[PDB]
Symmetry: D2
Subunit: 142 residues, 4 copies
């Protein structure tokens, strides 16, 4: 089994305040489950080859997704911003598989990714533990 534990840091009140609005798990590698402990979020997966997505909404209406998973025994991550309301995590998560339009990010197996939304909000996923079955990463909004 693999687990990915996330700590969420929000740096700039000017960007508004984000909260989780959805949490999905892909069905490969025997699925997996989200859990919360001590303000953190952990995705536990049955093995290598699946992932999960947290969607956040800010109190200013901004919608963004954070994807994390394990591909061929190495961690990966992605962030998608500027989402329309109909673009739920339920739509986003599957797009990393079956030759979908986000599969290329999963294939990169990134230990760190950052992007700034068109409206000017910075997002970063940075793994602090990058190897093994017990992975750790910070998610930073700014």
């Amino acid at each position: 089994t693999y687990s990915i534990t996330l700590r969420v840091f929000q740096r700039n009140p000017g960007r508004g305040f984000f909260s989780i609005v959805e949490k999905t798990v892909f069905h490969y590698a025997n699925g997996g489950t989200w859990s919360e402990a001590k303000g953190t979020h952990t995705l536990t997966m049955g093995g290598s080859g699946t992932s999960g997505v947290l969607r956040f909404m800010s109190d200013k209406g901004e919608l963004i997704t954070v994807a994390v998973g394990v591909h061929n025994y190495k961690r990966w991550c992605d962030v998608v911003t500027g989402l329309k309301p109909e673009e739920t995590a339920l739509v986003i998560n599957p797009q990393y598989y079956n030759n979908g339009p986000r599969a290329y990010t999963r294939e990169k197996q990134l230990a760190e990714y950052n992007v700034t939304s068109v409206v000017g909000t910075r997002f970063e996923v940075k793994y602090t533990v990058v190897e093994g079955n017990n992975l750790e990463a910070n998610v930073i909004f700014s």
Copy 2:
């Protein structure tokens, strides 16, 4: 817009203790978002015609989903038990649409549904406010 607010009651420690492991939102009617307040869970949707799913796991390993939505301006609900680990809410939610194998439950527009899992855990969704745009329901595990 429509919202559905859920209160979770767990009646029997013998059945183990359930916690949320996933929360999905379908993409129709401009999507929607889950939020938490005062121990309750609210699904807010852009209009009639979509839904969301909470998946729970008990500390005994039992996996079950609760679906709630609005179909043609009337509330609906469903409960699926005896799920395999790979049967995530990401798999379940879409099955209520596009002629999927659960669409028939959505079409019933039930204000109340109950089922007992094969392993003997009772589950009930019971709307306490059954009309209008601000719907309320109890989810009872037993």
Copy 3:
């Protein structure tokens, strides 16, 4: 150190739905801290000789406290119901020490306690692991 992990079961929707409105930790035995994980609540204490209180409020307005702790290396618990709004957990927790009017309950070192409020709500604390440093209990509202 000692920890007490609580699972909260609510059996009867007719009594309303309770949520936590306060969490205190008494200052003996090097203090301690409340944490949440997988829908459970854990009080971690620096040793034997302290306690914490969760105050709950129902959406019908009922106020009650659950006290748990370790006294001379044995778990204890108590429940106070019929609380006025000014009787916060900050008032209640210290009443178990120093000639306070609730000290006698701590001294009993109960592994189980139940009481029914004047307004008709049953409450029970029942330890499921009653010995050692890693204690477990179910809190049942009925």
Copy 4:
């Protein structure tokens, strides 16, 4: 009644990640209650003249308290850092009243307060809505 809603921003992962370990409510003005909604924390009070404290612990072990309240119809706040494990919120909250050593901070009715801990962690409370019965503030760890 008065309410104070807090949004918690954590800016610097190098300081560790803070989570709430205690929430107290002082017993004046008919008490009050903490609630959580959409990742925010609200203290609702029965009137002017009381307060509540959130104690936070970082995953590096740092202990700090944030106090907010209303004194003579004006908001107040304070932050205490460098706390020992025995200095729980239950000890700290009452020190703002009755000739306690922190009463002077309540009397200042600050709409903003900042302080840096001896171990180097910056903390700020900044009210974004500073008047009326529905107050709002950002709590910023840096």
